[PDB]
Backbone as JSON, one array per atom type, in Angstrom:
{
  "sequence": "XXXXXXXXXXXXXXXXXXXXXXXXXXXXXXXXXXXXXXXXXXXXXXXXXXXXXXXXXXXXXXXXXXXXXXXXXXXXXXXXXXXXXXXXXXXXXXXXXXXXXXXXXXXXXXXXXXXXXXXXX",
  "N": [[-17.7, 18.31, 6.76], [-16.28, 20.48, 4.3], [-14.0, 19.17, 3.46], [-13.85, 16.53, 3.91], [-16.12, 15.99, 1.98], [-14.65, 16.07, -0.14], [-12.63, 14.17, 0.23], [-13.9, 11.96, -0.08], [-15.0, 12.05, -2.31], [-12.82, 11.58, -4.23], [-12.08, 8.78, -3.04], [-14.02, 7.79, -3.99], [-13.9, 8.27, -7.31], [-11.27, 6.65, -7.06], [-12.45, 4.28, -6.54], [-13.67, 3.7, -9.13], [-11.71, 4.09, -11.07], [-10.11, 1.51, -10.33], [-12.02, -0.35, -10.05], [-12.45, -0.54, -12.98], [-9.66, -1.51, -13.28], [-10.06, -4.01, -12.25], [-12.12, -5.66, -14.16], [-10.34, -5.63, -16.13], [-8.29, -7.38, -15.35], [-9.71, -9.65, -14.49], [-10.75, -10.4, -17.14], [-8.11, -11.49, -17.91], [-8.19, -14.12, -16.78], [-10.04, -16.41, -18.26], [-10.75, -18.8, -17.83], [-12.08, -19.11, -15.92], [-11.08, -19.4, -13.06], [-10.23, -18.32, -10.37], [-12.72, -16.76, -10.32], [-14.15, -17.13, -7.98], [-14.13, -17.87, -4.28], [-11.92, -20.35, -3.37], [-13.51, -23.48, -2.46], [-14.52, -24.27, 0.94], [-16.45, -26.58, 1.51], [-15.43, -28.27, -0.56], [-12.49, -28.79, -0.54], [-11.3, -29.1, 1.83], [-9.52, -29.05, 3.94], [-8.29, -26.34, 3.16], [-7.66, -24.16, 4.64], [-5.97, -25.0, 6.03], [-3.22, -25.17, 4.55], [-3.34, -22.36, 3.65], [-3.34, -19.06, 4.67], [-4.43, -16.8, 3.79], [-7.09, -16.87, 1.98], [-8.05, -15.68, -0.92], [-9.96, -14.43, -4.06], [-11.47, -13.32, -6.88], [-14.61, -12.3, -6.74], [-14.35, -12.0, -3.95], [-12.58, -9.83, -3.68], [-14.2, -8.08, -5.66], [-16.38, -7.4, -3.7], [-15.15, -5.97, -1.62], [-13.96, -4.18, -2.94], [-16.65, -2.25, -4.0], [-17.64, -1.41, -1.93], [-16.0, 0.3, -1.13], [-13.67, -0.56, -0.13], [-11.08, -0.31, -0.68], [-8.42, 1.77, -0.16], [-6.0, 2.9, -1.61], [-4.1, 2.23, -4.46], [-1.53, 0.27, -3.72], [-3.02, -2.0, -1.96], [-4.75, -2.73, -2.88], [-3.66, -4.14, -4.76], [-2.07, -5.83, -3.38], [-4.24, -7.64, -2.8], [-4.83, -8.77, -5.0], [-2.13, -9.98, -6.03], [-2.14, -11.98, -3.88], [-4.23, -13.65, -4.56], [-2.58, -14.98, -6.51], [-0.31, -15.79, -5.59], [-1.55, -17.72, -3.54], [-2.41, -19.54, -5.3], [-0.09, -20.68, -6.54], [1.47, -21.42, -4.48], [-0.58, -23.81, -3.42], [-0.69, -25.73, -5.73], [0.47, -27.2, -7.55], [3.34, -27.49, -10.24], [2.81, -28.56, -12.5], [0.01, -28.12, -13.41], [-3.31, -26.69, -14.69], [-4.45, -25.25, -12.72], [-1.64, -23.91, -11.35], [-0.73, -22.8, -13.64], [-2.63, -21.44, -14.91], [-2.01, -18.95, -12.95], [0.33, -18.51, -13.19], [0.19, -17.01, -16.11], [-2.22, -15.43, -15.83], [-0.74, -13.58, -13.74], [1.64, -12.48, -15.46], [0.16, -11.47, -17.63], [-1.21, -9.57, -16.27], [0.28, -7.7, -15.24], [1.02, -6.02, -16.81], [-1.52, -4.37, -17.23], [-1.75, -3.32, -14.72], [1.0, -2.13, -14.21], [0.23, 0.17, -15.77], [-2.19, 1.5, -14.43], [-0.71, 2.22, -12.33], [0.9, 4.75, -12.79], [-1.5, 6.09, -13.4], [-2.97, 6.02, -11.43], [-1.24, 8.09, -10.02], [-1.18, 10.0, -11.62], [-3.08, 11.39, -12.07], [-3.56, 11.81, -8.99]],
  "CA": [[-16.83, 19.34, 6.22], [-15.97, 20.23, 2.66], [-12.38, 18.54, 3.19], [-14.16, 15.06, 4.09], [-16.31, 15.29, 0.97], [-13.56, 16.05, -1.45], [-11.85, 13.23, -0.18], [-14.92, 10.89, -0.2], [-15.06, 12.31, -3.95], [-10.99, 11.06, -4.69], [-11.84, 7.77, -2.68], [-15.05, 7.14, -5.08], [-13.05, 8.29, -8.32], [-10.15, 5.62, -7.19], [-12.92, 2.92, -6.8], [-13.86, 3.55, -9.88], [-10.45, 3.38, -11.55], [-9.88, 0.09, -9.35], [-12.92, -0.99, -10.85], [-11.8, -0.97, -14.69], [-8.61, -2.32, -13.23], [-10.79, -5.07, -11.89], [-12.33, -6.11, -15.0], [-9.24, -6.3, -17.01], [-7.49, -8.85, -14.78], [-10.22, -10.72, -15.0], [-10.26, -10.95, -18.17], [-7.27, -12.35, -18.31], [-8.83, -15.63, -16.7], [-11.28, -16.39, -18.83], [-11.36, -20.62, -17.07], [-13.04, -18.5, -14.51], [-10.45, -20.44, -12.07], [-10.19, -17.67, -9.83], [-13.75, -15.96, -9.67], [-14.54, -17.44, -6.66], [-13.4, -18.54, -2.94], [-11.99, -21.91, -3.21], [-14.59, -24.09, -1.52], [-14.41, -25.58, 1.94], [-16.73, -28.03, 0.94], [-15.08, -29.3, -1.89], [-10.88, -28.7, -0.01], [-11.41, -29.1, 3.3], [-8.1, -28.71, 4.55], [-7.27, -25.25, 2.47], [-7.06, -22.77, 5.0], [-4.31, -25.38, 6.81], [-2.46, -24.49, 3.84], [-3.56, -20.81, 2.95], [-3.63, -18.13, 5.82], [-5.8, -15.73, 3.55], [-7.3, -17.34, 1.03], [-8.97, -14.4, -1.95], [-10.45, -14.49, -5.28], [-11.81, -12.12, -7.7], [-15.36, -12.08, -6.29], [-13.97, -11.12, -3.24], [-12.36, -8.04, -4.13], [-14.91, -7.09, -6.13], [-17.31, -7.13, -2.83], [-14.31, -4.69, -1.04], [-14.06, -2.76, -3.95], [-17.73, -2.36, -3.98], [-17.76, -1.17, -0.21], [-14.94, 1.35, -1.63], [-12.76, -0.95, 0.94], [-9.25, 0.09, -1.08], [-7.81, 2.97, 0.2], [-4.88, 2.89, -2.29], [-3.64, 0.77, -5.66], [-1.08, -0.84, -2.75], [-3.97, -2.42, -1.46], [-5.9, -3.91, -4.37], [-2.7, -5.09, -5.4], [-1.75, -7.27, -2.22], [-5.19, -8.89, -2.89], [-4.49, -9.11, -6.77], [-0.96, -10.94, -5.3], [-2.92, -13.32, -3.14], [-4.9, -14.57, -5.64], [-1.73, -15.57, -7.52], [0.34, -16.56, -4.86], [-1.76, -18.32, -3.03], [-2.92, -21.04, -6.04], [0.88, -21.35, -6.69], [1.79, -22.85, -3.18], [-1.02, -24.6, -3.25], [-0.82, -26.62, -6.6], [2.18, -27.99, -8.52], [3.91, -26.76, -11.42], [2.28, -29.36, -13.82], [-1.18, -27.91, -12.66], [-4.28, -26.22, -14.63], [-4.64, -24.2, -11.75], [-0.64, -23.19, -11.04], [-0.36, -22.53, -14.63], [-3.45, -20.26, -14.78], [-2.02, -18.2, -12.3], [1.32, -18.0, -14.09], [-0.88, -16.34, -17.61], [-2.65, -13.92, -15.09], [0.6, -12.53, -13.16], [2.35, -12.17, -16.54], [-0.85, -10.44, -18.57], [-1.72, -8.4, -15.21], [1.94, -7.03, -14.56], [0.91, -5.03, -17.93], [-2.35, -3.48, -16.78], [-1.0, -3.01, -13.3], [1.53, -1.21, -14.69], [-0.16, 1.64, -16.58], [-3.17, 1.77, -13.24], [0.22, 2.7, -11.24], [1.46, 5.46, -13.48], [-3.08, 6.46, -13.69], [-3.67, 6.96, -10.06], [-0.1, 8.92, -9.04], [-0.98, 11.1, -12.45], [-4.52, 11.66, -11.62], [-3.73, 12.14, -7.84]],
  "C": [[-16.68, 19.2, 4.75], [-14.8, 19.22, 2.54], [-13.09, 17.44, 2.82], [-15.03, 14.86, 3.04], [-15.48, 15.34, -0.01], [-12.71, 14.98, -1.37], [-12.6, 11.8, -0.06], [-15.04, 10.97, -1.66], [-13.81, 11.59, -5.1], [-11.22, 9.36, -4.35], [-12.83, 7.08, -3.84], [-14.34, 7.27, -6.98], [-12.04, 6.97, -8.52], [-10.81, 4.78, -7.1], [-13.34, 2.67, -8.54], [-12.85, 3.25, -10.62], [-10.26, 1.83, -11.66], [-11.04, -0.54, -10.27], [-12.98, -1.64, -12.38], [-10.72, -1.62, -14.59], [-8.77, -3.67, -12.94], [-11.08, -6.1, -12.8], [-11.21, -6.36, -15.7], [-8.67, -7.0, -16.4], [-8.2, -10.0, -14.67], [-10.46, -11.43, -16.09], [-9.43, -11.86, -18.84], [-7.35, -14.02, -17.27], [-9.8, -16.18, -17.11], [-11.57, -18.03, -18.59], [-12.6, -19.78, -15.9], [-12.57, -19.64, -13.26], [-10.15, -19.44, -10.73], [-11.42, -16.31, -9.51], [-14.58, -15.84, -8.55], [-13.61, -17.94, -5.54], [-13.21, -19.52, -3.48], [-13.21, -22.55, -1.96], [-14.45, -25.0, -0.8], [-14.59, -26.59, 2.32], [-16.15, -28.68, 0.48], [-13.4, -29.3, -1.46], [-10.99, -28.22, 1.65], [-10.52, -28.59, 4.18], [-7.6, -27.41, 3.9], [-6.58, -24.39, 3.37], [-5.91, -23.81, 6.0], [-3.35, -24.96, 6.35], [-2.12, -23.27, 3.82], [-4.47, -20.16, 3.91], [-4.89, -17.31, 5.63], [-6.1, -15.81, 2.29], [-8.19, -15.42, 0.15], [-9.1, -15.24, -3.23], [-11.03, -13.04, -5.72], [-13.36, -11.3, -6.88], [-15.52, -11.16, -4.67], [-13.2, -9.65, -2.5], [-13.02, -7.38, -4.68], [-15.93, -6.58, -4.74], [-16.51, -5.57, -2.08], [-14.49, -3.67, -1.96], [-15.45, -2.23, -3.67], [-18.07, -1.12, -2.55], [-16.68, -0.2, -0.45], [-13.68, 1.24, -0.27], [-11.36, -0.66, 0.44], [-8.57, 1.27, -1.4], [-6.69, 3.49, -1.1], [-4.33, 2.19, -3.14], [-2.59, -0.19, -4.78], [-2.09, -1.85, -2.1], [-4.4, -3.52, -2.17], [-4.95, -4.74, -4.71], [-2.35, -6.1, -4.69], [-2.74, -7.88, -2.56], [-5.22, -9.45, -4.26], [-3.04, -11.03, -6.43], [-2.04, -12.25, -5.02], [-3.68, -14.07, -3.77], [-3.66, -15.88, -6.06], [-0.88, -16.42, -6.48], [0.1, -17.68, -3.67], [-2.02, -19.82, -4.04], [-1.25, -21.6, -6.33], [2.01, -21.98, -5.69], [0.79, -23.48, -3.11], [-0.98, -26.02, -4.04], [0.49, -26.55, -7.31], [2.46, -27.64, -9.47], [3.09, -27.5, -12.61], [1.0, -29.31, -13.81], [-1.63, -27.3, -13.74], [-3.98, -24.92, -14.12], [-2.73, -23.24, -11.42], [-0.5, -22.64, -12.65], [-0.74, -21.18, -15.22], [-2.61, -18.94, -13.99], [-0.57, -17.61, -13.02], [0.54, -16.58, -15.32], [-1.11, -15.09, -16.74], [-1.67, -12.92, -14.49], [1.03, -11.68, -14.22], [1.24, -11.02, -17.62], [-1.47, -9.27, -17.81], [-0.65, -7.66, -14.82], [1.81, -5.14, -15.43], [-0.34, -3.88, -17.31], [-2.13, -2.66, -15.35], [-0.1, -1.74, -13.11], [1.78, 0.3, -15.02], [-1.35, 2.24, -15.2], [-1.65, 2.73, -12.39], [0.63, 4.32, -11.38], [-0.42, 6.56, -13.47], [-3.16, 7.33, -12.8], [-2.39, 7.65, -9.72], [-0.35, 10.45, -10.41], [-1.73, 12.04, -12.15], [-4.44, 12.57, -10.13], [-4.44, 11.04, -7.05]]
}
């Protein structure tokens, strides 16, 4: 039907969005401490800790697959990034610290994406 491509047309538009929103949060990790899964090899025990572990790489694959229906979406896995390294690691951490920087410099881009896609449609 025409409906189902016009809204295959809105869903590819919002990956694309999502996509520039993508890159700028990465940006703001430039350790590259969050471009990948943590590795089961190397933390054996994570997922005892961490129910649903994410990283960047792995949103970009969803994104990719135009798996995010909605900026609510992207954002829970944006979250999970952050909230998962800061129960995992300690305040005097590298890694919890990182994730502090990214929340705080991604709140901004986040922000204006929110205000993008409800303007846009």
């Amino acid at each position: 039907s025409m409906e189902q491509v016009a809204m295959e047309l809105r869903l590819t538009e919002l990956t694309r969005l999502l996509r520039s929103v993508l890159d700028q949060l990465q940006d703001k990790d430039p350790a590259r401490i969050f471009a990948q899964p943590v590795s089961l090899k190397e933390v054996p025990d994570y997922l005892d800790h961490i129910k649903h572990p994410m990283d960047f790489a792995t949103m970009r694959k969803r994104l990719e697959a135009q798996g995010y229906k909605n900026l609510h979406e992207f954002e829970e896995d944006f979250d999970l990034i952050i909230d998962n390294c800061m129960k995992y690691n300690a305040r005097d951490t590298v890694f919890y610290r990182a994730a502090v920087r990214l929340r705080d410099q991604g709140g901004v881009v986040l922000r204006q994406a929110r205000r993008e896609v409800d303007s846009i449609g």
